[PDB]
Amino acid sequence: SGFRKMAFPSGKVEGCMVQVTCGTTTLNGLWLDDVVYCPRHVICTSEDMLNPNYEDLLIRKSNHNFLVQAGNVQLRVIGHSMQNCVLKLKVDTANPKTPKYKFVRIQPGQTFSVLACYNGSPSGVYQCAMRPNFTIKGSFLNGSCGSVGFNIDYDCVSFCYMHHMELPTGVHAGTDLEGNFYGPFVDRKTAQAAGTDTTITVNVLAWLYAAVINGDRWFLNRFTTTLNDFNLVAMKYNYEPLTQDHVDILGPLSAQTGIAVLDMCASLKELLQNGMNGRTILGSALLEDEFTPFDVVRQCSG
Amino acid sequence: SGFRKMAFPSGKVEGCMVQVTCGTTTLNGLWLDDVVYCPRHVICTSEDMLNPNYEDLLIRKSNHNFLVQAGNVQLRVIGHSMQNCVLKLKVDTANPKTPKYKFVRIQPGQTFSVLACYNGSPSGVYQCAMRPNFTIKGSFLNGSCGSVGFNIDYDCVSFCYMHHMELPTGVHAGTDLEGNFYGPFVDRKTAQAAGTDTTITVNVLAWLYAAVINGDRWFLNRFTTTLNDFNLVAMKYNYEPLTQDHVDILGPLSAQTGIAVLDMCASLKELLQNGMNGRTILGSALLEDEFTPFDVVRQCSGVTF
Ligand SMILES: *C(=N)[C@H](C[C@@H]1CCNC1=O)NC(=O)[C@@H]1[C@@H]2[C@H](CN1C(=O)[C@@H](NC(=O)C(F)(F)F)C(C)(C)C)C2(C)C
Ligand SMILES: *C(=N)[C@H](C[C@@H]1CCNC1=O)NC(=O)[C@@H]1[C@@H]2[C@H](CN1C(=O)[C@@H](NC(=O)C(F)(F)F)C(C)(C)C)C2(C)C
């Protein structure tokens, strides 16, 4: 029993974290085979943070301007290219700790683990979800940049996120490992703010199913709802609209518990109507939205 | 900025997890140098768990009774010994990934990282506190036994916990790596219950300090209390007493925020009496007590390797 916000073992990613330095800028790099991936804004001074021309700044750089350090070893840089907002440094050594990996772009709602690093040393690991507004509610200080988000599937590491910047509201923005930003952000210091956040409705229902399987039944009820009446009510609490696709994904938890998704939707509407009246679900007095249907099955049946 | 329940990187510890099988029981082992550590109750059958005679059950067992598997490779057991509630199996091979490590035993309120494992394969890492009643609120299914708790200080892994059992209340109990239980528990299937839990007061106050640092400041009030007067409120609300010791630990956070510890106590007191009056603190409707002062500093400022 028990239910924990639980990250993947960070071991396979720890073996890939290096320090990338350029001028007075030091941030973190991901060393896979003979390529170090890191945020391109490493090549910006304080000045060129406002309207950087990355193409112009990079053409000024030779291989020898990039100090790559893996623990003690300085890697020798033998090539640099840019792909979108990530800089790719070719090094003369393939990383011997390179795991089986892929690059994946995730959708809002998806969870992944973040290995927070400073100076190419891993600090800590925590579990994140991609918010509907394409930000993550992370924990990152100065020099954290180039810290990555990942999933692990059997022995394969799925890299989905590289950290770039903090927005004024304290939420974080970054790119996939092809360097395309999640959402409408750019690696410039400009007036840009996170859109209005919403609750990830599909995740809350999943978490309620976890509550049932872990033997908590105090919040259900005898009502059901139409998908439309559910969405019309939920949306007034800033909940993401639930789609037929979301219901389909809840098939397995519905079947395992024998509570139809629209029945559990009825429970949710009433929980929003009523709150907790003291009580808790799975040790929380808020409705948890950073557990996907997959995360529940893995932790409560695996 | 931001504040998360954050675990230590598990790499050094993932390199030490093995599978131990004795008869039809499989669980997890910790492989360090040429010894494998795992719960002694691996030797117990369903029958033997009700009234086990460990010294007797153990002496009836030869090394050939113990399958130790590191991935696909069999390790050869060349010796076996018991220390308190942990079985120590000498294996023919030293673990080449053995980190700098020591065994430490923690007090309630201290936090640590748990690496949950099944069949010697690490599944997940989460952050835990040793509860005041010496349980931990874990997430552990069948085969999780031999999952370890640790902290890291630079390159030294300090192992502090090995998982043994689930209490009927759904909370978890285990030992230090010398096999001494945390709390008044025994490794038999017999009926056991967690005593009544209390809230780790110093940790809430540390967490409230973490709130102030992230600009969540609404709960500050003008009032200050005294330790004596506060601790009377604490007891009523099933809160651990705040000691002179506890107050001194918070000096860094008091100094960093300019909020006196007994001032922060007044905010806390008022919160217990009044509730949160709608609001949340760092996105929680509950007062959080599983972040230590050291945990808060290692994330909100640095010292984070
Ligand atoms: C990488 N080391 C930091 C990560 C930041 C620092 C504080 N916590 C973090 O997660 N990244 C940066 O310094 C990026 C970098 C320029 C400015 N910047 C920011 O994080 C800033 N953000 C913005 O100005 C905003 F909102 F517009 F994006 C700041 C708020 C000053 C921390 C670039 C290229 C975005
Ligand atoms: C190790 N593989 C399991 C892990 C358990 C399984 C359910 N959740 C967990 O964390 N631990 C055990 O097999 C221990 C072990 C015998 C029985 N046991 C229990 O978990 C039982 N608990 C107790 O006996 C209790 F409550 F009294 F502490 C169970 C009835 C399954 C809850 C021994 C030696 C205690």
Looking up residue B231, the CATH number of its domain turns out to be 1.10.1840.10
Residue B134: what are its φ and ψ, rounded to 5°? 70, 15
Catalytic residues of B: 41, 145
Q: How far apart are CA B140 and CA B117, in angstroms?
A: 9
The whole-angstrom distance between residue A239's C-alpha and the CA centroid of its chain comes to 19
**Angle between helix A201-213 and A261-274 (nearest 10):** 100
Contact B133, B193 (CB under 8 A): no
d(CA B290, CA A43): 40
In this structure, the number of other CB atoms found within 10 A of the CB of residue B117 comes to 28
Atom number in ligand 1 closest to CA A172: 10
Cα separation, A161 vs A113, whole angstroms: 9
Does the beta-carbon distance from A124 to B170 stay under 8 Å?
Answer: no
Dist. CA B245–CA B205, nearest whole Å? 14
A142 Cα nearest atom in ligand 1: 6
Interface of B with A in 94-153 (CB under 8 A): 115-116, 118, 122-126, 137-141
B13's enclosing H/E stretch is: helix B11-14
Q: Half-sphere exposure of B207 toward its Cβ, with a 13 Å CA cutoff?
A: 22
Whether residue B175 contacts residue B35, with contact meaning beta carbons closer than 8 Å, is answered with no
**Closest residue by Cα to residue B219 from B171, B257, B249:** B257
In sign, the C-alpha dihedral spanning B25, B27, B32, B37 is negative
Quick one: A67 exposed, middle or buried, by C-beta within 10 A (0-12, 13-18, 19+)?
middle
Q: Using CA atoms, how far apart are residues A75 and B297, in angstroms rounded to an integer? A: 32
Q: Which residues contact A248 (CB under 8 A, 6 or more apart)?
A: none
Which ligand ends up closest to the CA of A190?
1
* Ligand in closest contact with the CA of A168: 1
- Technique employed here was X-ray
Answer whether B137 sits within 8 Å of A283, measured CB to CB.
yes
Interface with chain A: mutation pick from B111, B125, B300, highest number of A CBs within 10 Å: B125
Report the amino acid identity of residue A273: Q
Identify the three-state secondary structure at position A160.
Answer: strand
Q: Does B1 touch chain A (CB under 8 A)?
A: yes
B122–A6 C-beta distance less than 8 A: no
Cα separation, B143 vs B135, whole angstroms: 19
Q: Of how many residues is chain B composed? A: 305
User: Distance between CA B216 and CA A59 in Å, rounded?
Assistant: 44
**One-character DSSP codes across B148-202:** EEEEEETTEEEEEEEEEEE-TTS-EEEE-TTSPBSSS--SSSS---PPPP-B-HH
What are the chain A neighbours of B116 within 8 Å (beta carbons)?
Answer: 6
Q: Which residues of A touch B9 (CB under 8 A)?
A: 10-11, 14, 115, 122-125
Q: Which residues pair with A181 in a beta bridge?
A: A175
Distance CA A231, CA A239 (A): 8
- CA B153, distance to chain mean position in Å, is 16
- Scan for tokens 């007095």, then name that residue: A285
φ and ψ at residue B51, rounded to 5 degrees:
-145, 65
State whether B3 and A139 contact (CB < 8 Å).
yes
Amino acid letter, B169: T
Distance from CA of A35 to the nearest CA of B (A): 22
Q: Which of A212, A301, A214, A222 is nearest to A262 (CA)?
A: A222
SS3 for B238?
coil
| C-alpha pair distances (Å), B282 with each of A244, B4, B99, B207 | 33, 9, 35, 9
Are B22 and B65 in contact, with CB atoms under 8 Å apart? yes
Q: Are strands B121-129 and B111-118 parallel, antiparallel or unpaired?
A: antiparallel
Of residues B2, B137, B302, nearest to A139 (C-beta): B2
Cα(B35)–Cα(B78) distance, integer angstroms: 10
User: With contact defined as beta carbons under 8 Å apart, do A30 and A17 qualify?
Assistant: yes
Q: Enumerate residues 6+ apart whose C-beta is below 8 A from B275.
A: none
- Token digits of residue B20: 């131990």
State the Cα–Cα distance between residues B172 and B174, nearest whole angstrom: 7
Determine the residue type at A48.
D
SS3 call for B256: helix
Burial of B53 (0-12, 13-18, 19+ CB in 10 A): exposed
Pocket test for ligand 2, best of A1, A4, A299 (most atoms within 8 A of CB): A1
Minimal CA–CA distance to A39: which of A92, A89, A93? Answer: A89
**Residues B24 and A142: beta-carbon distance below 8 Å:** no
Q: Which amino acid is residue B23, in one-letter code? A: G
Task: Name the CA dihedral angle for B154, B160, B164, B167, rounded to a multiple of 10 degrees.
Answer: -110
**Neighbour count for residue A56 (Cβ, 10 Å):** 9
Residue type, A261: V
The pair of three-digit structure tokens given for residue B9, joined into one six-digit string: 């990187």
Distance, CA of A236 to CA of B19 (rounded, Å): 51
In chain A, which residue's Cα lies nearest the Cα of B214?
A170
Burial class (CB in 10 A: 0-12, 13-18, 19+), A267: buried
- B214/A126 touch (CB, cutoff 8 Å), yes or no: no
In Å, how far from its chain's centre is CA B246? 20
Q: Is the CB of A145 under 6 A from ligand 1?
A: yes
E runs forming strands in chain A: 17-22, 25-32, 35-39, 67-70, 73-75, 77-83, 86-91, 100-103, 111-118, 121-129, 148-153, 156-166, 172-175
Containing structural domain, residue A234? 201-300
A165 Cβ below 6 A of ligand 1: yes
**CATH code at B18?**
2.40.10.10
Single-letter amino acid, residue B131: R
First-residue to last-residue Cα distance in chain A: 12
Which residues does chain A have within 8 Å of residue B2's beta carbon, measured at their own beta carbons? 137-140, 170-172
Token pair, residue A298, equals: 């893995």
The sign of the CA dihedral A248, A252, A255, A257 is negative
Q: Which two tokens stand for residue A56?
A: 């112009």
Q: In angstroms, rounded to a whole number, what is the distance separating the alpha carbons of residues B260 and B258?
A: 6
Do A260 and A224 contact (CB within 8 A), yes or no? Answer: yes
Answer whether A275 touches B (CB < 8 Å).
no
Which of A4, A137, A138 comes nearest B126 by C-beta? A4
Residue of A124, A276, A302 with shortest CB distance to B304: A124
Q: Which of B118, B126, B140 sits opposite A5 (nearest CB)?
A: B126
Beta strands in chain B (DSSP E): 17-22, 25-32, 35-39, 67-70, 73-75, 77-83, 86-91, 101-103, 111-118, 121-129, 148-153, 156-166, 172-175
Angle between helices B201-213 and B293-300 (to 10 degrees): 20
- Ligand 1: residue whose CA is nearest its atom 18: A165
